[PDB]
Amino acid sequence: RAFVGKKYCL
Amino acid sequence: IQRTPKIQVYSRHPAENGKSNFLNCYVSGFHPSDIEVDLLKNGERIEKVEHSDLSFSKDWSFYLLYYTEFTPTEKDEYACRVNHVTLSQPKIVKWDRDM
Amino acid sequence: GSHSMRYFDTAMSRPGRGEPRFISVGYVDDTQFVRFDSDAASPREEPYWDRNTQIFKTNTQTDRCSLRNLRGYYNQSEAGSHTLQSMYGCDVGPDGRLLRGHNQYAYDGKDYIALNEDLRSWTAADTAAQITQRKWEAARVAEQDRAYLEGTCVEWLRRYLENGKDTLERADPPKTHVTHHPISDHEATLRCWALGFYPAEITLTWQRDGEDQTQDTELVETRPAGDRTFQKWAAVVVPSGEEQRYTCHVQHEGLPKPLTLRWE
């Protein structure tokens, strides 16, 4: 649904 | 590492004396992102200049567009003034309608 | 034609001036469709809302985590400012099918880590990025990134393209002219202009007697006009009298055929 991607901490 | 800005100063539409237009200063190719850009009219800072949202090219170098309304004339001189950590003093590029 | 959806994210630390600024800008091809800036009085700008805003807010916190970890991975002091950049998204072909996905990062302007084209494995630039790599392998991060890139990304891009077909799927050809400026009695500049085009991708070259003049052409970076379109020019210095030996060639998706132009 969301258009923005979830990020993960480096 | 650091990369110095590329600067272009130009109009949105082809320049016609007496006709309202937009003056652009496009800064690109720079790193890091902090940068100070002024548009000048006869040497003086134009107020309330807008800019685009910070973005970058696929080589990671940043770019911004700074822009304002302007009605060119034969007499008035326009320019863009840029400072960046890579520059020892502000760089001034003059508006030339052929570039 | 083919299309892309891409986010360009920047996070910048600023010791003594608050928490790192996070800005995320989303594009379809060369059209911005969303922005989120953690410094904005009004966060998000726009040319359900709730769920997307929450992801940008969480992404702000995630990039700040990342910046803290990176400083440690390089043994850096807490005094300096540092930059984390991210590109992510999907490319599709004319039929809407996935061409490829992207999820990659740079630290202080240097490539750091990237999801490979397989969407399953990583390429790490250095021993610091190897730490990130091992962490992401242990948490099966590539699988999550793959799912977004193949599912949500491609589905949203297809919907946006259809809803915005009158602009996003319209290529506007360049308007072209050649100008001529003497520099001396012996030589003149010919400048080939391209104005008003969309998307930004263009090829503009000069030839002399049908030979490319790559080394003697001044080519400016393609530049935004502010009305969605782009501009570019290419210039060559020519001996006086020889102008008609030079041709400007223009290729662009909006043209029915490539252009060959000369002075007048």
Q: DSSP labels for C156-181? A: HHHHHHHHTHHHHT-PBPPEEEEEEE
* Cβ-contact C245, C211 below 8 angstroms: no
Of C61, C59, C67, C68, nearest to C83 by C-alpha is C67
- CB proximity under 8 Å: A 1-10 to C: 1-10
Tokens 């110095």: give the residue. Answer: B4
| CA dist., res. C87 & res. C149, Å (int) | 12
The domain limits of chain C are: 3-168, 175-261
| CA dist., res. C203 & res. C99, Å (int) | 23
C and A in touch (3+ CB pairs within 8 angstroms): yes
**C37 phi and psi angles, rounded to 5 deg:** -130, 120
* Cβ-contact C228, C167 below 8 angstroms: yes
Task: Name the residue of chain B whose CA is nearest to C85's CA.
Answer: B60
Please name the amino acid found at residue C215.
Q
Q: Is C205 exposed, middle or buried (0-12, 13-18, 19+ CB in 10 A)?
A: middle
Resolution of this model in Å is 1.6
* Cβ-contact C111, C125 below 8 angstroms: yes
Q: Is the dihedral of CA C203, C209, C213, C216 positive or negative?
A: negative
> What is the token pair recorded at C19?
């928490």
| CA dist., res. C240 & res. C257, Å (int) | 30
Q: How many domains does chain B have?
A: 1
| CA dist., res. C112 & res. C105, Å (int) | 6
- Domain spanning C3-168: CATH 3.40.50.2000: no
CB distance from C8 to chain A under 8 Å?
Answer: no
Task: Name the residue of chain A whose CA is nearest to C102's CA.
Answer: A5
**Contacts with C174 from chain B: Cβ below 8 Å:** none
Q: How many CA atoms lie within 13 A of C170 on its CB side?
A: 9
Alpha helices in chain C (DSSP H): 49-73, 127-138, 141-147, 154-163, 165-168
CB distance from C23 to chain B under 8 Å?
Answer: yes
CB distance from B22 to chain C under 8 Å?
Answer: yes
Other residues' Cβ atoms within 10 Å of the Cβ of residue B47: 8
Q: Is the dihedral of CA C10, C16, C17, C19 positive or negative?
A: positive
CB distance from C25 to chain B under 8 Å?
Answer: yes
Q: How many CA atoms lie within 13 A of C99 on its CB side?
A: 14
Task: Name the residue of chain C whose CA is nearest to A4's CA.
Answer: C52
| CA dist., res. B42 & res. B38, Å (int) | 13
- List the CATH number of the domain containing B44: 2.60.40.10
Q: Is C146 exposed, middle or buried (0-12, 13-18, 19+ CB in 10 A)?
A: middle
- Domain spanning C175-261: CATH 2.60.40.10: yes
Neighbours of chain B (3+ CB pairs under 8 A): C
| CA dist., res. B62 & res. B8, Å (int) | 14
CA distance A1 to chain C (A): 7
Asked if C223's CB is within 8 angstroms of B53's CB, the reply is no
| CA dist., res. B98 & res. C20, Å (int) | 41
**Which one-letter DSSP state was computed for residue C131?**
H
| CA dist., res. C112 & res. C6, Å (int) | 18
Query: Partners of C63 in the beta sheet?
Result: none
Task: Name the residue of chain C whose CA is nearest to A1's CA.
Answer: C152
Question: In a mutagenesis test of the C interface, which of A1, A3, A6 is the best target, namely the one with the most C β-carbons within 10 Å?
Answer: A3
Asked if C231's CB is within 8 angstroms of B60's CB, the reply is no
CA distances C23 to B15, C6, C68, C81, Å, are 34, 14, 17, 16
CA distance A10 to chain C (A): 5
| CA dist., res. B68 & res. B91, Å (int) | 19
- Domain span including residue B33: 1-99
Question: In a mutagenesis test of the C interface, which of B1, B33, B86 is the best target, namely the one with the most C β-carbons within 10 Å?
Answer: B33
Q: How far is C-alpha B39 from the geometric centre of its chain's CA atoms?
A: 6
Asked if C225's CB is within 8 angstroms of B12's CB, the reply is yes
* Cβ-contact B56, B27 below 8 angstroms: no
Asked if C81's CB is within 8 angstroms of B32's CB, the reply is yes
* Radius of gyration (C-alpha) of chain B in whole angstroms: 14
Structural biology method used = X-ray
* Radius of gyration (C-alpha) of chain A in whole angstroms: 8
Asked if C139's CB is within 8 angstroms of A8's CB, the reply is yes
